[PDB]
Amino acid sequence: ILTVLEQSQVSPPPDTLGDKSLQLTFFDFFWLRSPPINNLFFYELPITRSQFTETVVPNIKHSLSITLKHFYPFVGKLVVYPAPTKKPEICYVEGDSVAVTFAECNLDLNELTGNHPRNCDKFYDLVPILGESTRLSDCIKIPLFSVQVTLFPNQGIAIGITNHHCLGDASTRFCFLKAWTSIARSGNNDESFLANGTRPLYDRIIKYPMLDEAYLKRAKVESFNEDYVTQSLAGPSDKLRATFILTRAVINQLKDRVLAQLPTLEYVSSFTVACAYIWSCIAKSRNDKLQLFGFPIDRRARMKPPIPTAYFGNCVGGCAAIAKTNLLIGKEGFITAAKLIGENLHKTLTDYKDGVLKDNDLVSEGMPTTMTWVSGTPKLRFYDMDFGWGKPKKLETVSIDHNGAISINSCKESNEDLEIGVCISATQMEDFVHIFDDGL
Numbered sequence: 479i480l481t482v483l484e485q486s487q488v489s490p491p492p493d494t495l496g497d498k499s500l501q502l503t504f505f506d507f508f509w510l511r512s513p514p515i516n517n518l519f520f521y522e523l524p525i526t527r528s529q530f531t532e533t534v535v536p537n538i539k540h541s542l543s544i545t546l547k548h549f550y551p552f553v554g555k556l557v558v559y560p561a562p563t564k565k566p567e568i569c570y571v572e573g574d575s576v577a578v579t580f581a582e583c584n585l586d587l588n589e590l591t592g593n594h595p596r597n598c599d600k601f602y603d604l605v606p607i608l609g610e611s612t613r614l615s616d617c618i619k620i621p622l623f624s625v626q627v628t629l630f631p632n633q634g635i636a637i638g639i640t641n642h643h644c645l646g647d648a649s650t651r652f653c654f655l656k657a658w659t660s661i662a663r664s665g666n667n668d669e670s671f672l673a674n675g676t677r678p679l680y681d682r683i684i685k686y687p688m689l690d691e692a693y694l695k696r697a698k699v700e701s702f703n704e705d706y707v708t709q710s711l712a713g714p715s716d717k718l719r720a721t722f723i724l725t726r727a728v729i730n731q732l733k734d735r736v737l738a739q740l741p742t743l744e745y746v747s748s749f750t751v752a753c754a755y756i757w758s759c760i761a762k763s764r765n766d767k768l769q770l771f772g773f774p775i776d777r778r779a780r781m782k783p784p785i786p787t788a789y790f791g792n793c794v795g796g797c798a799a800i801a802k803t804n805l806l807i808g809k810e811g812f813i814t815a816a817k818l819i820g821e822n823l824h825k826t827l828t829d830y831k832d833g834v835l836k837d838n839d840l841v842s843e844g845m846p847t848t849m850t851w852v853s854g855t856p857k858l859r860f861y862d863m864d865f866g867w868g869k870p871k872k873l874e875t876v877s878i879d880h881n882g883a884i885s886i887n888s889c890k891e892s893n894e895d896l897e898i899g900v901c902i903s904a905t906q907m908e909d910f911v912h913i914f915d916d917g918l
């Protein structure tokens with residue numbers, strides 16, 4: 479158990495924000511029908527219930543309230559209209575609030591923050607539901623952001639953050655969390671953020687209305703209202719969650735092996751080599767027929783002209799590779815995976831460089847028996863998010879439980895090591911652990 483201590487609603491301060499809209503782009507419209515993103519930050523601190531109630535609860539409410547006045551779309555809603563013409567948008571109205579749940583969990587915190595296999599479903603009631611939609615005559619309104627702060631008495635605190643992808647990408651979340659934590663750490667005060675921090679850029683500087691309508695047309699907006707359903711993760715399940723570590727020394731040795739065997743491969747990075755290694759492990763674990771492995775790309779810096787990091791919203795692309803499973807197994811399989819990822823990524827980056835804006839081919843060429851998409855951003859350090867109690871002990875992206883996805887992040891006793899999160903059935907996990915460890 480899970481005991482809910484308070485169900486609150488948090489708004490920007492009185493007499494700050496008026497009614498505000500944010501217009502969206504094809505980059506945002508792409509995510510119209512996506513499931514929620516669920517993220518957890520575990521902190522170790524010997525905190526009592528009385529202390530949690532006396533300072534943590536007020537501090538979370540206050541610091542968040544203040545942050546919201548600078549980050550209005552976080553307290554806004556996604557509004558989708560049934561006329562295929564009128565475009566979805568983010569609307570904040572005075573009176574809008576963020577659902578913030580405060581809870582207490584009696585599980586041992588040490589059993590959750592470890593890297594070894596733990597039940598995936600132990601994490602679900604640490605993350606808030608996105609929240610009920612509001613259905614009006616002219617529209618549906620969907621909440622964008624919710625929070626759960628859970629006390630582990632005498633042990634620590636988990637912060638559970640749920641968001642709709644339409645709100646923005648990992649960079650957007652990073653920018654918001656930077657501000658919120660700065661505001662919290664300095665005593666519920668935004669002066670350090672306003673003086674030294676990075677303010678979000680709401681200028682609509684991505685203007686491709688033809689793509690806008692094509693991605694919207696593809697999102698099937700006229701049926702969205704009738705089709706939309708809540709997508710909360712709930713137990714029970716036999717799936718296990720584990721974190722696998724690639725130390726910098728292992729990564730470097732893997733890079734070297736790729737560069738020696740394939741001296742003219744046009745793209746090799748710590749990232750591609752990490753993906754190739756995990757990809758190879760997944761192939762050996764599955765022993766299936768045909769696999770696709772892919773990952774998102776922050777396109778801000780690759781736009782022509784480049785988009786500021788502080789640009790608010792989505793600016794994400796993608797890259798995928800497909801390969802027969804037998805070609806991906808073993809030491810040579812790792813090499814092949816690196817080749818395929820490196821080649822596909824190089825191609826995608828060149829196509830961006832030369833202007834290209836877009837990107838059932840699977841029915842024709844072959845239906846993959848496994849598909850894996852990477853969540854996570856090793857070069858954005860979510861592991862440095864400090865609300866006043868110190869840096870996180872553990873980060874978990876819970877929403878990888880939903881589909882074919884793994885998470886890849888930095889560690890944060892090291893920005894140069896990689897932590898790889900996997901949630902898979904109990905029977906498959908035993909082999910996977912052996913496959914991962916043995917191959918290193």
Ligand SMILES: CC(C)(COP(=O)(O)OP(=O)(O)OC[C@@H]1O[C@@H](n2cnc3c(N)ncnc32)[C@@H](O)[C@H]1OP(=O)(O)O)[C@H](O)C(=O)NCCC(=O)NCCSC(=O)CC(=O)O
Nearest residue numbers: 647648744745746747748749750774775776794853854855
């Ligand atoms: C495609 C990427 C993953 C590629 O990562 P890389 O680490 O390779 O890229 P980078 O620019 O940081 O480059 C790091 C260094 O440059 C590389 N490098 C550059 N050019 C090269 C070339 N011609 N040959 C070989 N290597 C090259 C290496 O030197 C690498 O070394 P070194 O080994 O030293 O690094 C991308 O940089 C990116 O967009 N990452 C962010 C993705 C993101 O925003 N997340 C999703 C958003 S939200 C979402 O949808 C899901 C979610 O929540 O995550």
